[PDB]
Write a protein that holds these residues in place. Sequence first.
Motif, short mmCIF file in Angstrom:
data_model
loop_
_atom_site.label_atom_id
_atom_site.label_comp_id
_atom_site.label_asym_id
_atom_site.label_seq_id
_atom_site.Cartn_x
_atom_site.Cartn_y
_atom_site.Cartn_z
N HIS F 28 0.76 -1.28 -0.21
CA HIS F 28 0.21 0.38 0.32
C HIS F 28 0.80 1.32 -0.09
O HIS F 28 1.83 1.10 0.17
N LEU F 30 0.66 4.81 1.68
CA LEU F 30 0.92 5.30 1.84
C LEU F 30 1.24 4.46 3.55
O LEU F 30 2.39 4.30 4.49
N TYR F 31 0.23 3.53 3.31
CA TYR F 31 0.47 2.75 5.22
C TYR F 31 1.36 1.19 4.79
O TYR F 31 0.90 0.33 6.23
N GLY F 32 1.64 1.05 3.94
CA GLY F 32 2.56 -0.12 3.96
C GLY F 32 2.50 -1.72 3.49
O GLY F 32 2.95 -2.46 2.51
N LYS F 33 1.76 -2.00 3.89
CA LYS F 33 1.48 -3.61 3.84
C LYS F 33 1.03 -4.31 2.47
O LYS F 33 0.59 -3.22 2.25
N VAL F 34 1.09 -5.25 2.96
CA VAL F 34 1.41 -6.31 1.30
C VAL F 34 -0.02 -6.34 0.93
O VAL F 34 -0.92 -7.10 2.29
N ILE F 35 -0.82 -5.78 -0.12
CA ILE F 35 -2.03 -5.88 -0.41
C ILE F 35 -2.51 -6.39 -1.50
O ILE F 35 -1.26 -6.67 -2.20
#
Lengths: 83, 99, 138, 208, 124, 99
Positions: F28, F30-35
């Motif tokens: 993501h 901005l929020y970084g986690k793998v989506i």
Amino acid sequence: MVKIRLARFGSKHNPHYRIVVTDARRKRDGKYIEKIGYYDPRKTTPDWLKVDVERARYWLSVGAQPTDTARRLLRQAGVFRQE
Amino acid sequence: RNLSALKRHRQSLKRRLRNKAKKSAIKTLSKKAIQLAQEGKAEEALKIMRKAESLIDKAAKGSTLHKNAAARRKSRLMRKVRQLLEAAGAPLIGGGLSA
Amino acid sequence: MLTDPIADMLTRIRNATRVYKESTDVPASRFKEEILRILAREGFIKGYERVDVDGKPYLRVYLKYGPRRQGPDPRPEQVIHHIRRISKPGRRVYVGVKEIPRVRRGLGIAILSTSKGVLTDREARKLGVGGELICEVW
Amino acid sequence: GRYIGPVCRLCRREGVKLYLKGERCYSPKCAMERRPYPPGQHGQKRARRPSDYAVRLREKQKLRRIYGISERQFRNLFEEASKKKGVTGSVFLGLLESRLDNVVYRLGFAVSRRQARQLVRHGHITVNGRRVDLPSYRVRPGDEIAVAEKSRNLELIRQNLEAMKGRKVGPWLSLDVEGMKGKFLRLPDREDLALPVNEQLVIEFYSR
Amino acid sequence: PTINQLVRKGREKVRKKSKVPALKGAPFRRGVCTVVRTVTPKKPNSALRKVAKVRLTSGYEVTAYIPGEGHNLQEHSVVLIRGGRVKDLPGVRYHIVRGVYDAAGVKDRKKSRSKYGTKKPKEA
Amino acid sequence: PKKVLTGVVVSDKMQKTVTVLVERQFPHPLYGKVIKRSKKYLAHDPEEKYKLGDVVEIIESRPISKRKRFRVLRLVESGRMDLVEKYLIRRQNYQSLSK
RNA sequence: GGCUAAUCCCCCAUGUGGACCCGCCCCUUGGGGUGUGUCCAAAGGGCUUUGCCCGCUUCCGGAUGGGCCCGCGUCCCAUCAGCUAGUUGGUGGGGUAAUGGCCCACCAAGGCGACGACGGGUAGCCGGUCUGAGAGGAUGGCCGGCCACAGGGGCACUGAGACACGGGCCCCACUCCUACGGGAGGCAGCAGUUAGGAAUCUUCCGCAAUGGGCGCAAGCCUGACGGAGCGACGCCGCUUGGAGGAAGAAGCCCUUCGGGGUGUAAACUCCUGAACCCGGGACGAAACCCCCGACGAGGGGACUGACGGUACCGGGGUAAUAGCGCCGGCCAACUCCGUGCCAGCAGCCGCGGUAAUACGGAGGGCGCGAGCGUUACCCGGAUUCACUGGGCGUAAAGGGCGUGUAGGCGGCCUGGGGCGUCCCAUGUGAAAGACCACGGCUCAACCGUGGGGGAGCGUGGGAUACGCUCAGGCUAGACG
RNA sequence: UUUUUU
RNA sequence: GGGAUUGAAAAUCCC
Ligand SMILES: [Mg+2]
Ligand SMILES: [Mg+2]
Ligand SMILES: [Mg+2]
Ligand SMILES: [Mg+2]
Ligand SMILES: [Mg+2]
Ligand SMILES: [Mg+2]
Ligand SMILES: [Mg+2]
Ligand SMILES: [Mg+2]
Ligand SMILES: [Mg+2]
Ligand SMILES: [Mg+2]
Ligand SMILES: [Mg+2]
Ligand SMILES: [Mg+2]
Ligand SMILES: [Mg+2]
Ligand SMILES: [Mg+2]
Ligand SMILES: [Mg+2]
Ligand SMILES: [Mg+2]
Ligand SMILES: [Mg+2]
Ligand SMILES: [Mg+2]
Ligand SMILES: [Mg+2]
Ligand SMILES: [Mg+2]
Ligand SMILES: [Mg+2]
Ligand SMILES: [Mg+2]
Ligand SMILES: [Mg+2]
Ligand SMILES: [Mg+2]
Ligand SMILES: [Mg+2]
Ligand SMILES: [Mg+2]
Ligand SMILES: [Mg+2]
Ligand SMILES: [Mg+2]
Ligand SMILES: [Mg+2]
Ligand SMILES: [Mg+2]
Ligand SMILES: [Mg+2]
Ligand SMILES: [Mg+2]
Ligand SMILES: [Mg+2]
Ligand SMILES: [Mg+2]
Ligand SMILES: [Mg+2]
Ligand SMILES: [Mg+2]
Ligand SMILES: [Mg+2]
Ligand SMILES: [Mg+2]
Ligand SMILES: [Mg+2]
Ligand SMILES: [Mg+2]
Ligand SMILES: [Mg+2]
Ligand SMILES: [Mg+2]
Ligand SMILES: [Mg+2]
Ligand SMILES: [Mg+2]
Ligand SMILES: [Mg+2]
Ligand SMILES: [Mg+2]
Ligand SMILES: [Mg+2]
Ligand SMILES: [Mg+2]
Ligand SMILES: [Mg+2]
Ligand SMILES: [Mg+2]
Ligand SMILES: [Mg+2]
Ligand SMILES: [Mg+2]
Ligand SMILES: [Mg+2]
Ligand SMILES: [Mg+2]
Ligand SMILES: [Mg+2]
Ligand SMILES: [Mg+2]
Ligand SMILES: [Mg+2]
Ligand SMILES: [Mg+2]
Ligand SMILES: [Mg+2]
Ligand SMILES: [Mg+2]
Ligand SMILES: [Mg+2]
Ligand SMILES: [Mg+2]
Ligand SMILES: [Mg+2]
Ligand SMILES: [Mg+2]
Ligand SMILES: [Mg+2]
Ligand SMILES: [Mg+2]
Ligand SMILES: [Mg+2]
Ligand SMILES: [Mg+2]
Ligand SMILES: [Mg+2]
Ligand SMILES: [Mg+2]
Ligand SMILES: [Mg+2]
Ligand SMILES: [Mg+2]
Ligand SMILES: [Mg+2]
Ligand SMILES: [Mg+2]
Ligand SMILES: [Mg+2]
Ligand SMILES: [Mg+2]
Ligand SMILES: [Mg+2]
Ligand SMILES: [Mg+2]
Ligand SMILES: [Mg+2]
Ligand SMILES: [Mg+2]
Ligand SMILES: [Mg+2]
Ligand SMILES: [Mg+2]
Ligand SMILES: [Mg+2]
Ligand SMILES: [Mg+2]
Ligand SMILES: [Mg+2]
Ligand SMILES: [Mg+2]
Ligand SMILES: [Mg+2]
Ligand SMILES: [Mg+2]
Ligand SMILES: [Mg+2]
Ligand SMILES: [Mg+2]
Ligand SMILES: [Mg+2]
Ligand SMILES: [Mg+2]
Ligand SMILES: [Mg+2]
Ligand SMILES: [Mg+2]
Ligand SMILES: [Mg+2]
Ligand SMILES: [Mg+2]
Ligand SMILES: [Mg+2]
Ligand SMILES: [Mg+2]
Ligand SMILES: [Mg+2]
Ligand SMILES: [Mg+2]
Ligand SMILES: [Mg+2]
Ligand SMILES: [Mg+2]
Ligand SMILES: [Mg+2]
Ligand SMILES: [Mg+2]
Ligand SMILES: [Mg+2]
Ligand SMILES: [Mg+2]
Ligand SMILES: [Mg+2]
Ligand SMILES: [Mg+2]
Ligand SMILES: [Mg+2]
Ligand SMILES: [Mg+2]
Ligand SMILES: [Mg+2]
Ligand SMILES: [Mg+2]
Ligand SMILES: [Mg+2]
Ligand SMILES: [Mg+2]
Ligand SMILES: [Mg+2]
Ligand SMILES: [Mg+2]
Ligand SMILES: [Mg+2]
Ligand SMILES: [Mg+2]
Ligand SMILES: [Mg+2]
Ligand SMILES: [Mg+2]
Ligand SMILES: [Mg+2]
Ligand SMILES: [Mg+2]
Ligand SMILES: [Mg+2]
Ligand SMILES: [Mg+2]
Ligand SMILES: [Mg+2]
Ligand SMILES: [Mg+2]
Ligand SMILES: [Mg+2]
Ligand SMILES: [Mg+2]
Ligand SMILES: [Mg+2]
Ligand SMILES: [Mg+2]
Ligand SMILES: [Mg+2]
Ligand SMILES: [Zn+2]
């Protein structure tokens, strides 16, 4: 028809040109294909003309067309001198 | 007022008539040729199809069909004739098509 | 089930040092063992050793602390002042070699897991590789 | 146009001798003599402990008023120095000391800063042989700052250079007194300047 | 909020509402006066504050404060609206520019003449 | 490079066409986690070879119709309906969350 | 209705070659070759008229510009949850430069959606710009790139290119001519008028430069452009003097009535010399062209200014505009008189109801200074939408509880793969801007030259700890 | 009842 | 609109 001509980059009463390859249909100051030198008409610096001949010689091989002024400058840097 | 680019519109309408008429003949001969192919008459269809081709490639000489537009019609024409001539085939004239 | 075994281990150590335990067990995993190796090398623990507890393997971690201090609250200074998991499940954190941080202006570490192995930041910058950022320790 | 008005009044508000008057800031008349208190009706009243801001403000004024510059050019100069490599503090000084008008004063061609300003503005000053009538012009290291021979016969110049015989010049300057020449050898260092100013206070003024 | 939650819903930028509906958000707006009144203020104070109802070129009708010690503003005079509230009168959000079309500047004002719109006098 | 994608066939029900579902993974911004997003591509299957559950490579091609700009390159793996039922169940949940 | 020319139009010919059907060969979507058959070319003009210049025709390639297609990114509302009939695909056809439901006939019954379909609202997009420590927020004027539009709506024609701002047709609204039958228009080109509005310019000079169109050229056209004009609208440079000058004039202000203040400030002494006058006076301009040499290289030579008699240089030379805001705290700067919850101030907290540093004036002081204040808007302070970087016992906030769908998340050991992740190389990241360095205007603003950086994505090569995945095993979780 | 807690 | 009244007002009272 792609052309070799000058584009104005100075300021008011301080003109500085960019010898430039571009399609004859774009604005004189607009997007261009390659910058192949510069020209200072008021000769304010010891070096007020440069070309990179070997590149100018390329665009003439593929059919660029210099202005009366552009050619007058290219002849000064000896693009056409052939000896 | 009265800019004489009106001359351009004048010529526009002349060319309109030239192009318009050339194409009318293209269409009228192609349909004539395909009709004869559908009706089995092999010689007459070929003799006509040749004129259609000639008329097509001639329209490409000017600014009517200039492009591959000519080849489209020629291609589609020769295709339909040879296929329609696949009903008691016997391609008599054999002029236009290939062995 | 345990959720993030590494943070679990980091915390076992965190909670154990605040009461000045001599040792602490963490459930045994090779990856955990490679973290413990970097800490042992870096001087944050005396060291670790494998051990069984009711049949199942564990890792004793032998913590270290400073000297006993002067008047009130003699409890020693910590060697591990701060341990913090960085790349957790549900938000994973990877850094290129230029994105590797300087931890406490050099006085700490950042344990990276890289394709060349679990390295400290310095070792990873010198090896010229990045990877997943496991934690700050300082 | 810079500040034009009473000056030995500003000597007073800063509480330090300001030498903008040229001479007579040396003679026992500077009004820093026997009147060191600030100007106005409340000058002789006991001052209140200054705010942390008040200190930083009076220190920049102490510096800006010394060089006789508008806040505009003053602030531009400073924002310039914080970009250039090196100590923002000293670099700032070296830029004010590179002003031609100040250089002319430092070289003893004129008595004061303000007088040096008028000498430049009126073309009496030569830079490397050419006339320069801009006080803000920045002197480069190596440039020759001379007196235009048109004014070399002027009695104000022969006056000031008369008193300059045997007087020493800054370690970043040197001058020939007869031909009225002069040279800017290098930029001055913090130590080179005796200015009664804490630059760190001025840097801290612009942090806000 | 879990990171997942931020991926699902995310933060919400706070929309700031305007304190001055002088439409087209212009710096000033001109209007014609409807009434000229004098109103009692909020609790801690007491006076007679001079105001005016104004029909605006924005299509709005709002009250405006008449600054200064005296005014020439009448029922039908045309005026320019400034904005900025009068704290101690409720519902008065815009001021009046003095020295504009039909609102003369304050006579004999010698200190703050930019505000209150008065010229520079001569000294003999 | 003509873009090549790998997804799973979720729709047999057209003529000479299969629906390929192509998953994607990324952090993501901005929020970084793998989506994990996933898009359905309409792929051209001229021989009707490929069936439901086949995991196929898909390749950017010259337009076949509207909505059709890919052809089926090859079969990576055949017959995993678990991937199809994950998508079926999801589509089936949409019958609630209306009224 | 009639005559006539051509670089206008047509027929025959020549087939380098190309086009098309079929076959074959190699490539692999409609790319390249080959055979037979069929179809297809053209235009002249000028002279220094035996040769050369400008053109014409068919074909292959280059160059430049563009059409179409795809991955990814691109605001708000879920008080918009279901949308879809050429709609989704197919076969054949039409059309085009070319793929395509782009259009058509027929067949199948599909396609899209909570990963936000459909609807609504708003809005050209980007390079960049403003801000911010940054991450981010905001914005898209000028300059540069792409797009769309030319009173509103539709459509084509001509052409290499348009569905065409100063081209055509039709419908509608509006203005003008009208012999009432019918016609002419279309500044979102430059200026300029008018209306709206808080608000935005000259009906200027010029073809001298740069660039564009046509012409062999001479040359013509160019409100592109280059210049000037108006507006402190922004930025930058500059002046309103400099040096001497009283333990200190007058006036004004305060006062313990001693004195203190404006203040070296003025007066006055000496010096310089913004304005203004006089003389000189540009760079921007060298080609096109002419001559020599072959209309090449090369050499030689000649004409050509709007700005403008402006810049600049030299001579002469006058002491020669200061304003605006603030002084209760935040916030730098304080006293008197006036007024008495009045008149008024106020960004917030608050001042004013008889001694007000907060109102109004004076004296004084502080801050900027050809400016200074104000209002509006944007970011900041705001870690006050918290990714960096917040929270929920009593402050705003745990759903009344369970069951469980999707989704998110996943214990220990081995192996395969290498999707995420990491490294190298490479292409791309236009120019301008930003950054560093040097240089040109006396400085600067401005401008020029060179240098470096860059997230992202393409491609090739590699690594495998971690996450993913497939295969196998374990029993500490869970279940029995 | 209203301001002002000195 | 003036007095009593209050620190000053409202109220209340007096010409
Ligand atoms: Mg173009
Ligand atoms: Mg170059
Ligand atoms: Mg040269
Ligand atoms: Mg050269
Ligand atoms: Mg020209
Ligand atoms: Mg050559
Ligand atoms: Mg030779
Ligand atoms: Mg006409
Ligand atoms: Mg014509
Ligand atoms: Mg017919
Ligand atoms: Mg024939
Ligand atoms: Mg056409
Ligand atoms: Mg983090
Ligand atoms: Mg990276
Ligand atoms: Mg760091
Ligand atoms: Mg980091
Ligand atoms: Mg290395
Ligand atoms: Mg610095
Ligand atoms: Mg540094
Ligand atoms: Mg000195
Ligand atoms: Mg030195
Ligand atoms: Mg700052
Ligand atoms: Mg999103
Ligand atoms: Mg999601
Ligand atoms: Mg949101
Ligand atoms: Mg609005
Ligand atoms: Mg309205
Ligand atoms: Mg309205
Ligand atoms: Mg306000
Ligand atoms: Mg998959
Ligand atoms: Mg099927
Ligand atoms: Mg996204
Ligand atoms: Mg983002
Ligand atoms: Mg971020
Ligand atoms: Mg295939
Ligand atoms: Mg393959
Ligand atoms: Mg799925
Ligand atoms: Mg006739
Ligand atoms: Mg006729
Ligand atoms: Mg022929
Ligand atoms: Mg041949
Ligand atoms: Mg066949
Ligand atoms: Mg043949
Ligand atoms: Mg012809
Ligand atoms: Mg001839
Ligand atoms: Mg002849
Ligand atoms: Mg002849
Ligand atoms: Mg091409
Ligand atoms: Mg191309
Ligand atoms: Mg909105
Ligand atoms: Mg739909
Ligand atoms: Mg519909
Ligand atoms: Mg329909
Ligand atoms: Mg088709
Ligand atoms: Mg076309
Ligand atoms: Mg087709
Ligand atoms: Mg069928
Ligand atoms: Mg999706
Ligand atoms: Mg889905
Ligand atoms: Mg809409
Ligand atoms: Mg819009
Ligand atoms: Mg910045
Ligand atoms: Mg943004
Ligand atoms: Mg926007
Ligand atoms: Mg944006
Ligand atoms: Mg935007
Ligand atoms: Mg413009
Ligand atoms: Mg810009
Ligand atoms: Mg410009
Ligand atoms: Mg633009
Ligand atoms: Mg594009
Ligand atoms: Mg339209
Ligand atoms: Mg229209
Ligand atoms: Mg044409
Ligand atoms: Mg168009
Ligand atoms: Mg159009
Ligand atoms: Mg027009
Ligand atoms: Mg017309
Ligand atoms: Mg007409
Ligand atoms: Mg209106
Ligand atoms: Mg109006
Ligand atoms: Mg203009
Ligand atoms: Mg020509
Ligand atoms: Mg001739
Ligand atoms: Mg004309
Ligand atoms: Mg212009
Ligand atoms: Mg200025
Ligand atoms: Mg003086
Ligand atoms: Mg003189
Ligand atoms: Mg010239
Ligand atoms: Mg010249
Ligand atoms: Mg000419
Ligand atoms: Mg000759
Ligand atoms: Mg020559
Ligand atoms: Mg002179
Ligand atoms: Mg004077
Ligand atoms: Mg204060
Ligand atoms: Mg005030
Ligand atoms: Mg009184
Ligand atoms: Mg009083
Ligand atoms: Mg009081
Ligand atoms: Mg006061
Ligand atoms: Mg006051
Ligand atoms: Mg004053
Ligand atoms: Mg302003
Ligand atoms: Mg704000
Ligand atoms: Mg923030
Ligand atoms: Mg808030
Ligand atoms: Mg957070
Ligand atoms: Mg940190
Ligand atoms: Mg909070
Ligand atoms: Mg909680
Ligand atoms: Mg409560
Ligand atoms: Mg509960
Ligand atoms: Mg449960
Ligand atoms: Mg589940
Ligand atoms: Mg796992
Ligand atoms: Mg999983
Ligand atoms: Mg493995
Ligand atoms: Mg293998
Ligand atoms: Mg990989
Ligand atoms: Mg790169
Ligand atoms: Mg760039
Ligand atoms: Mg910035
Ligand atoms: Mg320079
Ligand atoms: Mg790079
Ligand atoms: Mg790769
Ligand atoms: Mg067992
Ligand atoms: Mg049990
Ligand atoms: Mg009572
Ligand atoms: Mg209190
Ligand atoms: Zn002094």
